[PDB]
């Protein structure tokens, strides 16, 4: 994993944001309830 402070999230230009650093070891526990995926393309007929 990597950490990035300056974040433009939702891409809107003209305004950025900086996330101040947090003192010390950071720990967060998360529970994964969902997913988002995409598919490939024709490739080979009824193959994979």
């Amino acid at each position: 994993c990597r950490i990035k402070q300056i974040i433009n999230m939702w891409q809107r230009i003209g305004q950025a944001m900086y996330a101040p650093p947090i003192q010390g070891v950071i720990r967060c526990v998360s529970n994964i309830t969902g997913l988002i995926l995409t598919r490939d393309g024709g490739s080979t007929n009824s193959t994979t």
């Epitope: 891409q11 393309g41 024709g42 490739s43």
Partner: antibody
């Protein structure tokens, strides 16, 4: 109006790599898909992929996957495309095209190609 | 190319011609997504038909197209010298599927 302007024709050695740009203008850049198509001389159209400017979402085809590096500069409004491991079979004229209907919120399409790049001739000879 | 087109079509100036796009039910039959492009020699391809029949803004009313089952068709009436050029039928089968392309000429 809108315009799709690509880079210049290049002459390179085989096995090397080549990058080609496209610079759109006159519309909302971050919200419009960009197709890339090469046409070998006398051949038909060969679709090489597309890049959604929104966060940079890309999808390529099967036969071109792994030699194709396609990006865009949303700041400077310049699409990019790259082909490596140059072979004589990779010599063609490469285009960039936009899908018909776009937006910043909902989407669709597939079919649409309206605005077309002028083409860029990449030559591979030893 | 996954879509079948004629190699060349010749017709007399002023007549009507039909260009066929034929494929499986994966593209032509099971989708409305067939589209057609004009290309002048040495210049970029230009869209002509989409949605199996549609005309983008600024296409001559003489042009039109359709799809019959697994076979899609293109039609150009009022033929003129500006129409002598390459035409390619595109349809979507999960990818981008094209036609081989067809050349237009004068007949007689």
């Amino acid at each position: 109006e809108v315009q799709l302007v690509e880079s210049g024709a290049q002459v390179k050695k085989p096995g090397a790599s080549v990058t080609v740009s496209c610079t759109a203008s006159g519309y909302k850049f971050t919200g419009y898909h960009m197709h890339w198509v090469r046409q070998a001389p006398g051949r038909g159209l060969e679709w090489m992929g597309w890049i959604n400017p929104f966060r940079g979402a890309v999808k390529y085809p099967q036969n071109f996957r792994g030699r194709v590096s396609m990006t865009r500069d949303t700041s400077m409004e310049i699409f990019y495309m790259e082909l490596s491991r140059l072979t004589s079979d990779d010599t063609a004229v490469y285009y960039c095209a936009r899908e018909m209907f776009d937006s910043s919120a909902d989407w669709s399409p597939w079919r649409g190609m309206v605005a077309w790049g002028q083409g860029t001739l990449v030559t591979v000879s030893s | 190319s996954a879509l079948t087109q004629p190699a060349s079509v010749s017709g007399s100036p002023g007549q009507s011609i039909t260009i066929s796009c034929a494929g499986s039910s994966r593209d032509v039959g099971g989708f409305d997504l067939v589209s057609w492009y004009q290309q002048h020699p040495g210049k970029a391809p230009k869209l002509i038909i989409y949605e199996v029949n549609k005309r983008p803004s600024g296409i001559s009313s003489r042009f039109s197209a359709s799809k019959s089952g697994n076979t899609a068709s293109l039609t150009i009436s009022g033929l003129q010298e500006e129409d002598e050029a390459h035409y390619y039928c595109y349809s979507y089968a999960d990818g981008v599927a094209f036609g081989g392309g067809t050349k237009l000429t004068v007949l007689g």
